[PDB]
Amino acid sequence: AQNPNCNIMIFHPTKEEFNDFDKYIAYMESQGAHRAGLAKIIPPKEWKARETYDNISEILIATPLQQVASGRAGVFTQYHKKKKAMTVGEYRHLANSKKYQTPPHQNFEDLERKYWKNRIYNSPIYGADISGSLFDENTKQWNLGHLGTIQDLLEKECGVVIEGVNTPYLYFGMWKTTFAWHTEDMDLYSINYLHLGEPKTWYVVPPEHGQRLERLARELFPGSSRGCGAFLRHKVALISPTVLKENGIPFNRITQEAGEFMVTFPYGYHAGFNHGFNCAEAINFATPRWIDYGKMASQCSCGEARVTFSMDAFVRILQPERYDLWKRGQ
Numbered sequence: 385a386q387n388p389n390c391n392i393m394i395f396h397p398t399k400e401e402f403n404d405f406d407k408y409i410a411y412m413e414s415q416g417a418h419r420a421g422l423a424k425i426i427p428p429k430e431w432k433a434r435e436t437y438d439n440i441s442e443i444l445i446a447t448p449l450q451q452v453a454s455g456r457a458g459v460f461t462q463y464h465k466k467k468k469a470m471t472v473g474e475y476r477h478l479a480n481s482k483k484y485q486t487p488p489h490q491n492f493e494d495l496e497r498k499y500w501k502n503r504i505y506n507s508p509i510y511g512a513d514i515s516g517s518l519f520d521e522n523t524k525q526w527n528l529g530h531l532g533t534i535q536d537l538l539e540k541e542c543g544v545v546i547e548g549v550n551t552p553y554l555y556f557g558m559w560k561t562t563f564a565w566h567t568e569d570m571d572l573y574s575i576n577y578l579h580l581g582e583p584k585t586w587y588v589v590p591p592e593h594g595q596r597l598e599r600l601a602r603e604l605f606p607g608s609s610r611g612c613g614a615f616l617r618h619k620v621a622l623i624s625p626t627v628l629k630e631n632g633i634p635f636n637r638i639t640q641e642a643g644e645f646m647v648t649f650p651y652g653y654h655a656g657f658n659h660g661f662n663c664a665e666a667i668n669f670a671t672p673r674w675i676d677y678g679k680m681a682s683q684c685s686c687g688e689a690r691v692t693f694s695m696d697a698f699v700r701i702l703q704p705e706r707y708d709l710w711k712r713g714q
């Protein structure tokens with residue numbers, strides 16, 4: 385078995401190897417990358433997503449989200465308070481203001497310490513989940529807007545044609561903006577490219593140990609757990625590395641910098657935070673190996689979790705037994 389300790393692996397494809405996306409994902413998994421739940425891919429030195437990021441200030445963040453925390457420093461939930469629309473230019477200026485700017489710090493490790501000590505006492509604003517792409521249409525390799533769709537993958541593997549499309553999303557971040565512990569919808573893969581700005585720190589639990597995290601979450605968020613059997617789908621719960629370590633939960637951490645890809649693998653729980661103003665792009669994707677994860681993925685039926693148009697068909701085909709009750713919630 386490759387990568388038995390489930391370490392986060394870092395890959396350095398040549399431009400040649402970077403020319404077939406599906407093939408390279410398969411290669412990474414042949415080396416055991418998926419066992420970590422997360423991998424980093426550093427693109428070839430001659431590759432670029434686009435020429436410059438000089439013309440992005442007019443992108444609109446229609447619904448910026450203020451992330452308000454409740455709980456203890458190492459164990460908290462966050463809710464999203466909707467704010468008035470602003471452009472990326474306006475958002476960037478806000479992120480860089482005295483109220484929201486990254487504080488002085490010695491290194492990544494010091495900043496991480498400051499995050500977990502101080503996160504709950506501030507409410508940063510996140511420009512998350514914006515439909516769109518910053519890849520140049522002429523960028524041919526690893527263009528997140530030109531990937532094969534999950535619908536076409538499902539059709540290729542299971543012989544069923546389904547409705548739906550899947551497109552990329554943009555994430556404009558600032559210091560302390562946070563993504564809560566979760567797996568992807570239907571336990572899909574995700575691929576995330578950090579286009580510009582300050583880093584993004586990730587935490588991840590190996591897929592083979594996901595149920596250990598769930599068990600701890602039920603204990604740490606007893607109210608949320610009773611309300612919904614798959615409450616992490618709400619994407620609201622944070623647990624610090626210190627608390628994970630205290631409770632024996634296997635996990636790993638890594639910091640993503642501008643110009644780098646991160647891939648999350650099926651049923652790899654992850655969470656993290658942004659160091660300062662940045663912009664990332666992400667999309668879900670599937671491979672043949674995902675299919676069996678899709679069939680087993682837990683669903684929120686309490687109504688809280690966000691439901692996309694495309695999800696209907698994946699539940700309908702892969703989880704016909706769940707389909708009725710899942711549809712009632714949504």
Ligand SMILES: O=c1[nH]c(Oc2cn[nH]c2)nc2cnccc12
Nearest residue numbers: 512513555562563564576619664
């Ligand atoms: O970088 C990420 N940002 C992000 O934004 C959020 C949307 N809702 N709450 C946070 N979500 C992510 C989810 N999985 C991986 C990376 C991210």
Ligand SMILES: [Co+2]
Nearest residue numbers: 567568574648
């Ligand atoms: Co994710």
Ligand SMILES: [Zn+2]
Nearest residue numbers: 612684686688
């Ligand atoms: Zn729920």
